[PDB]
Write a protein that binds this DNA or RNA. Structure first.
Lengths: 107, 100, 18, 112, 82, 94, 80, 97, 106, 89
DNA sequence: CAGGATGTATATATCTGACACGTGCCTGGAGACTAGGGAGTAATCCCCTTGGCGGTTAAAACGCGGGGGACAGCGCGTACGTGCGTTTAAGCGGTGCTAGAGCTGTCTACGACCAATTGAGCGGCCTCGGCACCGGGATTCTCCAGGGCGGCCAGTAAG
DNA sequence: TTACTGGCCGCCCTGGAGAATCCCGGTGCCGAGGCCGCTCAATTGGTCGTAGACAGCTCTAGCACCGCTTAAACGCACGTACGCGCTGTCCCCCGCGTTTTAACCGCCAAGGGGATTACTCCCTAGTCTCCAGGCACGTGTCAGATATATACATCCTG
């Protein structure tokens, strides 16, 4: 019979197979259901399809096509809920989100 | 008489605050850092060799720790209503976090 | 102002591209 | 080096060039490797005050002041650099110190 | 053998950070004080970093190691090694 | 000498949501390490869930309960609404 | 149960902070603390319920709250 | 009549509390506070009388830590009386905002 | 041959076996070495053989023979070398170490 | 239920002192947490090094990461005694 | 300094509900024996850190004024704490009810496992366009010297 | 006698003079990415063994309510300590030249150690069988809670 990749049937972009192995190898539980990978690739594929579209819309505003960490650091700290998910993470080459306390500004 | 046109004390720093937050390069000078890490690890286990990136990975984190400190000691210095930060704040902003 | 994201749209738009 | 009497008190200066005004063509150490002195014709755009020009003349660079700000002097303003010539600047400088304070007495009288 | 490197973190390099942080005026004592903090932070990360390196019996501290020592303390790092 | 990664996938998604933009290496190795972080929290969460309830295995539900704890706020109501939409399509297509 | 956060009294907060170490408590705290305590429970409960809602149970038992607290980093001891 | 100067009873109230471990938040007003929060997450919940305690002993401690941090922030600002400025700072610096 | 418990053979008091069975079923790894649990049993002892020690002294200095949860909260918050191991954890019914800042005191 | 085990220790270190039925709960809730942290760190440590099996050396290295300072010295000094004593018989 | 008043600490005695020990029990652990699969052990090699060399210039150190913030002092007035009196509802102890937690038994659907198959994603090569860089005008930002503007007395107009 | 406009001091925003920064027009540079083998991990087709899904049932533990004591809350009064706003003082850090320095770059190398295979071995998982240590329940003295009634302890407040 003809081979249809399991990532196709789910319609996902991330690979469901490669996850379905990683759940076994990482020793997360003694058995892994067939529903977990398909469900776990979607969530990943959703999030990774979130930071990017945000990063992209940050790239266009700096008049650069390509995404670079400085764009990512801007896409994550601006958003309020992504920042809360990655609260502890420190992005390499990331730079900081521009912020000056109002008391310091001259007058 | 004789005026060199010196900017007002306070507006060079804000300027260069606006210049660094925008930029993203590394601030702590690379080589004098590397000679520090090699010197710290020389204490815990003699005769180590550091992979190139493994030195970079530290400096990338050591910076973004201090910057996380200053951006949090400043909030303490704004708090006493003054502008100039002072060691009696980095002594605070590290005990509030509980990291001590 | 020279470097800006301007924060176009923040609230989620669930995969209209699907 | 040189010192330039600017009004009341002088300041620290450096000889930017050495010029014979009778030759009407100045010799200067160019900027940077060591740049050997070159004898160049006096600039028409360049203006010379007479005191510098009667005797041997020389354009100067003040220490602490930017080159764009830096300007000319006379020669009576210039006495050869000497610790004694530095002292008189300081005496005037001290005399300039309370000069702001002596004026402030009128402001002290203004406030009270 | 290496000695006296902490004073290698140049005094401007302390303010150049602090600018990016967002402070305007910096007192005189901060400079000498900050080194005291950064040195504490390395003796933590480096140590945990060394321990893994000793563990796999490999002499060279792998870049992947430092990402772990950080991940344990709570400051995850993205982009180096993975 | 192969170190498998998500460099192909993240790049494929990027074309779906920005048919022009492309991503640079040092920015990819972030995403390649962001996923390997999330996928190690979610799974690492639905490993304790199954253990607590004494269920031996890990199934999808145990992932919903794993997502609705980590992903904060609006993401939780979008991820699980994006997860089920996948798994429902999968089983019905098998 | 329309307003129960007004049930955590003024002497309730005053008693707590007295244990904390303060001396004089400014008036606007007694209201503002309620804002903190509320947004603390809304995080601890919303996790405790999810563990419960998963196991199909209808009771948020202590073995849940200890778990919900653990992810918060505020590990709790003495219950399980 | 006889009165203590301001503050002298405050310290006496501290050593009378920092030496004791009894629960400070009144219980039956807390029980009704937890129930109210649970509703908008799920309806008809039933809490084990232990799991209302385990919340209280947690949310009491959370606050006592917060108040120590605010007291530090106020001793820093050079005044004695904590204030919402101090609360908000002691939360922002913790990063638990 | 009479059975001798691994815990007793090693001279320890904590159950080597019960720790061993826990290490297997927790899904930490596919295989657990023979010497792994006995080592972990000892490390568990010394952490209880010290907290129960410091708390044990708290009873004497407080004149109550039975150790109540406060006597734990005084054994760990006094000792720095232990406090960092117990940084985030809360102890129920533990109270707080008694102190007051210098500015507060009259 | 590590409580019987805890009592055996306490009655050793203090032949007279007793333990309340809530402390046991603290300890039974405490030992389990330390054991989870250590054995959890041990599992992650073997995964980084591609090793399949947790062994005696994995736990020792797992300790020196968690226990701060002086505890790391005496714990691993205690652990090595147990293995050598066990391996003796 | 002198001295009453107060609060906590201290002593003696009286109960209890509660933790320590006893005893029975059964379920997890110890004995005993493999099996192959993971782990250690030996060359090897190559690529990748450590190490030195010299130019060079970006940057760190150093020097000085003075401009502005740190800090101390002070006046104060109000938002606090303290105490009383009243009034709430919290805690205790019961009575009665039942959702629902926990546990059993049955057995079907589900996932582990395997052989053969195949194409997805890997490493490697190669390229040309996105972008870093530099140059010099154009444009913006900042600082400051000179400049219209109410608040007073002086002599104003006068009941 | 009363009455109060005018004059002079009072003192801004605004142009300029720079510096800093942006714009844009080239000008190379190298890695983003596209393409090409290929191999090894995912896929497919089948079996087997059981985890848990499901149904039913036994009792716990929770909910509801309620009536009583009384301790905690609440509101009012008051008096005063402190947060704070103002002034004044001065030191110390920012700003900007100079002067020294050592990071950097690029460049070469050498040998060291991390990364393959081969091999061989020995150790833990798996399994079966028997039994005693840990658990649950019972109980029974007993150290701690509790009531009451001294002995100083600090605190004011003269």
């Amino acid at each position: 019979a003809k081979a249809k990749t399991r990532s196709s049937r789910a319609g996902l972009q991330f690979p469901v197979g490669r996850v379905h192995r990683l759940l076994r190898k990482g020793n997360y539980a003694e058995r892994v259901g067939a529903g977990a990978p398909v469900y776990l690739a979607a969530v990943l594929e959703y999030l990774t399809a979130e930071i990017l579209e945000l990063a992209g819309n940050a790239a266009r505003d700096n008049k650069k096509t390509r995404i670079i960490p400085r764009h990512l650091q801007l896409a994550v700290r601006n958003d309020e809920e992504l920042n809360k998910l990655l609260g502890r993470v420190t992005i390499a080459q990331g730079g900081v989100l521009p912020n000056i306390q109002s008391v310091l500004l001259p007058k | 008489v004789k005026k060199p046109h010196r900017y007002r004390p306070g507006t060079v720093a804000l300027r260069e605050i606006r210049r660094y937050q925008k930029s993203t390069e590394l601030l702590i000078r690379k080589l004098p850092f590397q000679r520090l890490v090699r010197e710290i690890a020389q204490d815990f286990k003699t005769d180590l060799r550091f992979q190139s990136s493994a030195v970079m990975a530290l400096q990338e984190a050591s910076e973004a720790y201090l910057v996380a400190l200053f951006e949090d000691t400043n909030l303490a210095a704004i708090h006493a209503k003054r502008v100039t930060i002072m060691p009696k704040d980095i002594q605070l902003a590290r005990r509030i976090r509980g990291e001590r | 102002r020279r470097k800006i994201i301007t924060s176009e749209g923040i609230e989620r738009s669930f995969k209209n591209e699907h | 080096r040189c010192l330039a009497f600017h009004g009341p008190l002088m300041y620290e200066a450096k000889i930017l060039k050495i010029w014979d005004p009778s030759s009407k063509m100045y010799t200067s150490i160019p900027n940077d490797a060591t740049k050997e002195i070159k004898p160049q014709k006096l600039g028409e755009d360049e203006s010379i005050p007479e005191e510098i020009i009667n005797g041997k003349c020389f354009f100067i660079h003040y220490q602490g002041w930017k080159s764009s700000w830096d300007e000319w002097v006379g020669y009576d303003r210039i006495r050869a650099y000497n610790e004694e010539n530095i002292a008189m600047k300081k005496r005037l400088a001290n005399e300039a110190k309370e000069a702001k304070k002596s004026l402030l007495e009128q402001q002290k009288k203004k406030k009270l | 053998v290496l000695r006296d490197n902490i004073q290698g973190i140049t005094k401007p390099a302390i303010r150049r950070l602090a600018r990016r942080g967002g402070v305007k005026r910096i007192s005189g004592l901060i400079y000498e004080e900050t080194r005291g903090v950064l040195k504490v932070f390395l003796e933590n990360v480096i140590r945990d970093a060394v321990t893994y390196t000793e563990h796999a019996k490999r002499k060279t501290v792998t870049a992947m190691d430092v990402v772990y020592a950080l991940k344990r303390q709570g400051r995850t790092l993205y982009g180096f090694g993975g | 000498t192969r170190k498998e990664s998500y460099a192909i996938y993240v790049y494929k998604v990027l074309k779906q949501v920005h048919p022009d933009t492309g991503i640079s290496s040092k920015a990819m190795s972030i995403m390649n390490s962001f996923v390997n972080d999330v996928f190690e929290r979610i799974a690492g969460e639905a490993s304790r869930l199954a253990h607590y309830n004494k269920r031996s295995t890990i199934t999808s539900r145990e992932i919903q309960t794993a997502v609705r704890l980590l992903l904060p706020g609006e993401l939780a109501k979008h991820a699980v609404s994006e997860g089920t939409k996948a798994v429902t399509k999968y089983t019905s297509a098998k």
